[PDB]
Amino acid sequence: MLKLKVEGMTCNHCVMAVTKALKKVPGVEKVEVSLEKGEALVEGTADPKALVQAVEEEGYKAEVLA
């Protein structure tokens, strides 16, 4: 159970990109993002950098909060 801060392009379809881009790697599979806030929670054992880096590639901003 880890949480990722998400910032940047405050739009609806962006949520689709991050949930899919994160679960792309076999690992967590359970990834959720808040509709009202840029907060995301993940349930698995994947690395922090894997998530941070994966969302970074799209041009969006993020920060892991252990």
From TrEMBL:
<dbReference type="InterPro" id="IPR036163">
    <property type="entry name" value="HMA_dom_sf"/>
</dbReference>
<dbReference type="InterPro" id="IPR006121">
    <property type="entry name" value="HMA_dom"/>
</dbReference>
<dbReference type="InterPro" id="IPR017969">
    <property type="entry name" value="Heavy-metal-associated_CS"/>
</dbReference>
<dbReference type="GO" id="GO:0046872">
    <property type="term" value="F:metal ion binding"/>
</dbReference>
<keyword id="KW-0479">Metal-binding</keyword>
<dbReference type="Pfam" id="PF00403">
    <property type="entry name" value="HMA"/>
</dbReference>
<protein>
    <submittedName>
        <fullName>Heavy metal binding protein</fullName>
    </submittedName>
</protein>
<feature type="domain" description="HMA">
    <location>
        <begin position="1"/>
        <end position="63"/>
    </location>
</feature>
